[model samples]
Target: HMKISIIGAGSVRFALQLVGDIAQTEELSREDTHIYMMDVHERRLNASYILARKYVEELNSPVKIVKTSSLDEAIDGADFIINTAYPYDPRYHDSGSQRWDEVTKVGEKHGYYRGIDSQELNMVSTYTYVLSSYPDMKLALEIAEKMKKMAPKAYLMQTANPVFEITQAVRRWTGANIVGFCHGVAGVYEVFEKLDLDPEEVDWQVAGVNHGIWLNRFRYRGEDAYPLLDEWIEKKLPEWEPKNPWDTQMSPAAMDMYKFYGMLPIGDTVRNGSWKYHYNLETKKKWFGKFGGIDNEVERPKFHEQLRRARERLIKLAEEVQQNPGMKLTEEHPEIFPKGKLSGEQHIPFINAIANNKRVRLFLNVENQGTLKDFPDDVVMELPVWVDCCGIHREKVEPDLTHRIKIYLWPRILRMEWNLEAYISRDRKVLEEILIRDPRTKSYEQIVQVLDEIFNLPFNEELRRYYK
Candidate 1:
C-alpha cells in the first residue's frame, strides 16, 4: 500500500489541488493507497480533510483520507511526505502583527528592494529574510527528524518558498532523502500562451535556481522556435500591451531578459534577477510599466486581500459541505469543482513514477552533486532530474550560459548560499560579516542599529533561537 502524508494539509487550496492530482494518478488512486492530511490549524485541517475525503469518495476511488494535528502521527510509516504548510504567519496570534509584511516593510524602509545591486546593504534585510524563513525551516527540520525516527525510508517533497534554502537545510540537518518542488517551470507554457502558440506543439528545457531558471531550448516540431518567439515579439507583443503593469499577463522584463541574455528567463526568473528592472519605482515603471513592477506597493496588499477573501470562501465551502452529508463536489459541477484532473503539481506523479518504476523527466531542486559546474557540490540547485524505482537522480546537463551571465549569477548565488548556511548554523558573526561586507552598508553603527531594531520586532521572540 502507498502511504502519502501531506504535512501542511491545512492549506485548502493546495490540499485540494494535491488530492485532485493524486486522484488522477493511476498507480496510486485505488484501494491500496492511503492519504494522510496533517496540519497544526484545527479548523483549516478539518476543512481540508473533509473536502478531500468527500471529493475522493464521490470519485468512487478507494483512497482513504485521514487528518491529524500530530507531526509524529502524520509521518508514521509514510512513503511520501508532502509539505505545504504556512508556519510564518504572526497574525494568527495577534491581529495587529503581520510579521511577513512587517519584515518586508522594514526592509523597504531601509532601502532594500529587489535586484543584486540594490541588495548590498541588504545584510540586515538578509538577516530578517532568514529570520522570516526560520519558522518554516524549524517545522521542516522537525518533520524531517520525525520522519528520521518513524518513517526512516520515506522521501520528503518540500513545496514551500525559500525552496532552495529550506531544501538544503533539510538535507544537511536531517537524514531524510528530500527534494524541492515548485511550478515556476510551468511559466514556459505562458510564454507560448501569450504568442497564441500551442505549448503542446513546442518542446523546451529549463535549468537553474528556483525562480531563476533559464529556458535553454524552445523548439517547435524539432526545430528551433526562436524565430516564432521573435515574430511574436515583433507583431503580437505590442498589441497585447497591458493597461497596467500589474495586469500584464506576460512580463515585459522577461522579454527584455530574453533579448539581452540570449535565453528566456522563465517564471519568476524573468524579474528575480539583475538590479536593473527593480531598483526604484521609476525604473520599475520603465521596465514593468505604470503599476511599477510585480508585487509593488500598490498591488501586493490587494493581492493579499484577494487571497484572504479566497481563503474565506474555501472555509465557508468546507463548513457547508460538513454540515450537509449529501453534499458532493465532483465532475457534475464543473464550475464548482473539476474532477479527475491531473493538476500539473508534479509531486504525486513523481511519486507514481517511483512506485511504478517509470522513468520520467522532472524539474526539481536537488543537491548539485556536480550537475552544475559553476556551483559548489553542497549547494542545492534546481535542475532536471530523472526519477524511477532506483531513486530520484539528478541528470548532468551541459551548462548553457555566457561568461558574462555566469559571472553575474555566480557571485549572487554564492552570497545566497552563504546566508543560507549562516541561517542553518546560527552564526551571527557570519551573518554580521556578510552584512558588513555588503556594498550597501556604509557604517558598522548603522548595521548594528538595524540589527537591533529587527530583533526588537514583535515576532522576534519566536525567532529568539537564531537571534541569540
Candidate 2:
C-alpha cells in the first residue's frame, strides 16, 4: 500500500475534495491506499475523518483513512507528505485583536495601500518583503528541519502561500524532494469561459514564479490565439463588463497588463502585477473602476466568515452521510461529484502518476535546473514537469519573458533568495537588505522601524528570541 500523509487536514473543504478526488480515481481506488490525516484542531480533524471514511466506503475503494495528531507518527513510513497548514497565527498567543490588523494599520498610515503585502502591490515584492516581515518563514523552515529528520526521502509537496519561497528553502536546506502546488492557473479557464471559447480547444502554457506566472503561449486549435484575444478585447469586453465589476472573469487591469507586457497575466498577477496599477485608492478606482482595489479592505474580513460557513456545510454533509450509510455520496452531491473528470487539484493525479508509472504533464514549482537561461537552479520556478514512477522530472522550456519583464522578475527572485538565506542563516542584515531592495520601500528608517515592530508584535516571542 502506498502511504499518503496530509498535514493540516483541518481545512475541511480541501480535505474533503482530496478524499473525493482519490476515491474518484479508479487507478488509485482499486489499489490499497492508506491516508493519514493530521491536524491540531480536534473538531476539524473529526469532520475530515468522518467524510473521508464515508466517501471511501461509498466508492467501495480499498483506501483506508486514519486520523492522527502526531507529526512524527504521520511522517513515519509515508511516501508522500502533503502540507497545507495555515502559517502560525499570532492571535492565539495574545488576548488582543489580530496582530495583522496592527501591522496593516501601520502600513496604511505610511501610504501603503490597504497594508503592506496587500494584493494592491507587486506580487513579488509582497511575497519577499511582506512574508519576510513575519515568522512564517521560520515556521516553514522548522517544518523542513522536522521533515529532514522524520521523512528524509519522502516527497514534500507543499500547498502554501509564498509557495515559491518556502519550497526553495526546503529544497536548499533539506534532503527531501519538494514540489510547490497552486491553483492560481485555474483562473485562466475562467478567461476562456468569458470569451465563450472552450478551454480544450486552446493549447496554453504558463510559467514563472508562483502568483506572478506569465501566460507564455496560447494557441487555438494549433494556431496563434493572440489575434483572437486582441479582437475580443477591442470588440466584446466593454459590452461584457459586469454591473458589479467585482464579479468578473476578466478585468481592465489584466487586459492593460497584456498590452504592456506582450504576455497575458492571469490570476493574482493580473490583479497585482505592478505597483503602477495599485498605488492608492484613486489610482485603483481609475484603473479598476467599479471593481475597486483588488484588496478591498472591507471584503477581507468576510473570507473568514465564508470559510466558517463552508465548514459548517461540510460538517452537516458528514452528519447526514453518517446517519444514512445507504445513501450514495455522488447521488447526494451530484454537482460536486461529477464523475470521470480530473480536478484542478494536483496531489491525487500526481500520486496516481507516480504509483502507476504513468507519464503526466503537470504544472509544478521546482528548482530551475537550467530550464530557463537567466535564472539559477537555486530559484524555484513554476513550470510543467513530466512525472512517473521513477520521480518527477523537470521539462526544459526556454526562458520566454521579455527583457523588461525579466528584469522585473529576477530582482524579486533574488530578494526571495536573500530572504531565504537570511531566514535559514538567521542573518538580520540580509533581512534588512531584502527590505531595502523592495520596489515599494520608501525609506530605510521606516523599513527598520517596520521590521522592528513586526518582530516585537505579540505572538512573535520565538522570532524575537531568535533575532535578539
Candidate 3:
C-alpha cells in the first residue's frame, strides 16, 4: 500500500483531474492506495472528497480518499507529497490601481513585454505577490517543514509556480529529496507535433530556468528542424500566438536573453521575449518602464484578474466533468483546464521513462562534474541525467567545451547562479558586472536605473539592510 498527500487541494477541479490520472494509471493507482487531500477551504475539500470517492468507486479500486484541513494529518505516513497551492491571499488586486499599466510600460521600455499574458500584468504580478508573501530563499519552506515533520519518509514533488526558482530554493534550504515539475516544455512540444515531425523521433534540449529553458538543441532524423519552423513563425501558431491578438508583442525578454547569453531562455515574453522574437531595445525598455505616460504595473492587474477568472472557469468545467464520468475535455478552454498534461509526444520522453521506469537519457541541471571543462566540475549545469525514485542523478558526459566564449561567460554566469540560489541586493560591484553583462542594459545608466527600480520595492529593505 502506498500513501500520497496533496496540499492546496481547494482547486479540486484540477486536483480531481490529476487524481483521475493517478487512478487510471497502473503505476499510480493501487488497490491499497491511500490519498489524503488537504486545503484551507472546507467546502472545496468536501467537493474533492466526494469526487475522489466517486472516482475510486467507479474504478472499482480499493484506494481510500480522505480530505482534511490539517496539513499534519494529510501528510502523516505519506509516501509522496505533491503541492499545488496559490500561496498569497486573494484580496490583492492592482488592476484599477494603475500598477498593471506601470509594469507593462516598464517591460515595454526596458523589459520584455509579451503584451499582458505571460508578463507585465500576469506573470510579473504573480511573481511579485509570491516574492512578497514567502521566504525567497526557502520558498515553500513552511509547507516542506510540515511535510518533513509529518512524513519524513515521503519524497516531495513540487508542482508549484516558478518551478525552477522554487526547486532551487528547496534544494538549497532543505534536506528532503525533491524534484520540480512543469508542463511548459510539453507545451513547446505541441507546436512541434503540428510540424509533421514524428513526435517520437524529434529530440529537444531545454537549457535555462524551467519556464525560460529553450529548444536549444532540437532535431529530427539527425537534421536540424528549426530552420523549417520559419513557416510557423510567419503563420503564427495558435499556442505561440502573441497576446492582445492584435499586438504582435513577441516574448522579447526571453529572446534577448538567448541572443545575449547564447542560450535559449523561453520564459516570460516580458523578460526574455527577444530570444526568438524580433523586438527593438527601445520597445523592450518601454515595456518594463514608462513611455508616453504609460507603464507596465498598470497593465499587470488585468492579467491577474484574467488568471483568476480562468481558474474559476476551470473549476466550473470540472464540475461538469464530475457529473459525467466519461466526459472528455478535448475541446475544453485552457482557462478551465486545471492540471497540465503532456502536450506532445516529444515534449518529455522522461515522463514516459518515469512512467515505465525504463532507463532514459535526458538533459537536466546538476553539478558539472568534469562535464564542462571550462567550469568547476562541482557546479550544476544543464547536462544529461538519469532519473527515477532516487530523484535526478547527473551522469558524466564530456561537455562540448570547444568554444572559448563558454569559458569567458562563466564569471557572469557564476554570479547569476548565486543570485538564483539566494536573492542578492544592490552589491554595486556585482550590479555593475551583472548589468554590463546583461544584454538589455546598453549603458551604465540603464543598469543603474534598473537596479534602482529593482531595489526600490519594500522587500529589498531587508536585502539593503543586510548588505548595508
Candidate 4:
C-alpha cells in the first residue's frame, strides 16, 4: 500500500477534496492505496470520516480511508504526509474562523495595519512572520522530528503557511524529504483569462517563494505574451474593476509592480508588495480595487463568512450522506467530482507522479540547490518542476528573475531568516529587531510595550516561555 495521511483532516473542505481527488484518480484509487485521516476534533473528524467513506463507496473506489487521533500512528509506514493543521482557532464546536480578529485588532491598536505579523513583502493576512507564527512552526518541527523515527523516507508535504520558512527549517534542521505546495501560482490564469488567452496555447512559468512568486515566463503559441500584457496594461488597466474582494489577480497593484519590478507579480505576491499599497484601506482601494483587497478590516472579517458557510454545508452534506446512504457522490457533487477531470490540488497528483510513475509538470516549493543564480540551495523556492517516480527535476528558469525581483526577494529572505532565528534560538531581540525595523515603530519602548502586551495574553504562554 502507498500509505498517505492528511494531518488536519478536520478541515472538512480540504479533507473531502483530497478524498474526492484520490477517488477519481485511477492510478491512486487502487485497493492498495491507503489514506489516513487524522485530526484532534472528534466531531469534525467524524464528519470527515463519514463523508469520505460514503463518497468513496458511492464512487465505488477501493482506496482505504483510515481515521486517527495520534500523529505517531498517522505517520507510521506512510509514504506521503500532508500537514494542513491549523492549531489556531475558530474552535470546531460552534466553529467560527475569525481567530485572526484578536491578534489583528491588538496589532491595529498599536498602528500596524492587518497585523504586526504583516511585514513588508511578507504580508498575506494570516500568513504570519514572527511572534504569531511560533506555534504553527512548532507544530511543523514537531511533525518533522516525529517523522525521522516513524516515516523516515516519507515526503513531508508542507502545506502550511510560511511555507518558505517551515520548509527551510525542516530541510535544514531534520533532513526530511520536504516539498511546499501552494495554489497561489494559479493566479497566473487570471492574467490569461483577462487577456483572452487560451491556457493550452499560452506558455507560462511562475517562481519565487510561496505567496510571493512572479511570472518569470510567458509566451503565446511560442511567441512572447508579455507584449500583449503590456497592451492590456496600456489600454485595459485604467478601467479595470475587481469582481470582489479576493479578485486581485490582475489589479492596479499587479501592473504597478510589473512596472517597477520589471516582472509581473502573480497571485498573493500582489498582496505581499511594499507598504506603499497596504498602508491603509484608502491606499489599498486606490491600488487593489474597491474592496481594498482581502487584508483590510472590512474584507478580512467577511472572508470568514464563506468558511463558516462551507463548514456548515460540509457538515450538512455529511448528515445527508448518512440520511441517504445510496446517494451517488459523483452525482451529488459534480464540483468535487467533475465528469473526467482531477481536482487541481497538487498533493494527490504529486503522490501519483512519484508513487505511480505518472509524470507531470507542477509548481512546487523545493530547495534552491543552485537552480537559480542568486539564491542559495537551502532556501526553499517555489519553482516549476517535473515529478515522477525517480525524483523532482526543476525546469531551468531560462530568462531568470530580473535584478529588481531578486533585490525585492532579499528583504523578504532576511525577514524570514529573522523569523526562523527567533523561533529556533528563542531570542527576544530577534523579535524586537523585527519591529524596530518596522515603518510603524516610533520609539524603542513602543516595541517593548507592544510585544510586552502581546506576550501577556493567555494563549501566548508558550511564546512567553520561549522568549523569556
Candidate 1 error regions (>4 Å): 89-97, 113-128, 242-250, 331-336, 396-399, 436-442
lDDT for position 15 in model 2: 78
lDDT of 2 by residue, 1-468 (tens): 777888888776677778778877877775568888998777678878887787677667778888998888888878888887664453562211244555666666665555555632343223433445445555556667777787776787888556877888778877457789876777678777876779888888787877777778788876877788899899876765534434433677777878877887767666665667666656665566665543555444454445567777777777887788878767778664444555667888898888788678888888878777888977888887889998878765533776766775786686566656776666677667765666667888877777677677666666777767
Among these predictions, the greatest lDDT belongs to 4
lDDT of each: 0.70, 0.70, 0.50, 0.84
lDDT of 3 by residue, 1-468 (tens): 667778777666567665655665555567666777998766567766765666556555566787888877877878777777654322442122233234334434555343222221124233432122233333367667776787787656666654544555565666555556654444345446557777778866554334334455666787876665655545643344343411222333333343455444333322434222224335534433222011233344555566567556545654776787675443343322323342222113343354446455555444455655666654445555676544566654322422433642354345435445334343455545644654455677765665455445453454445444
Structural RMSD, model 4: 2.0
By descending lDDT, how would the candidates be arranged? 4, 1, 2, 3
Clashing pairs in 2: none
Question: Mind sharing the TM-score for model 3?
Answer: 0.63
lDDT per residue, candidate 1, 168-255, as tens digits? 8788767478889987788777778776778788777788876667877788877888888888878776655556534433656667
Estimate the lDDT of model 3.
0.50
Report backbone clashes per prediction.
2, 0, 67, 1
User: Judged by lDDT against the true structure, how good is candidate 2?
Assistant: 0.70
The TM-score between candidate 2 and the true structure equals 0.87
Q: What is the C-alpha RMSD of each candidate to the true structure, in Å?
A: 3.5, 3.5, 7.4, 2.0
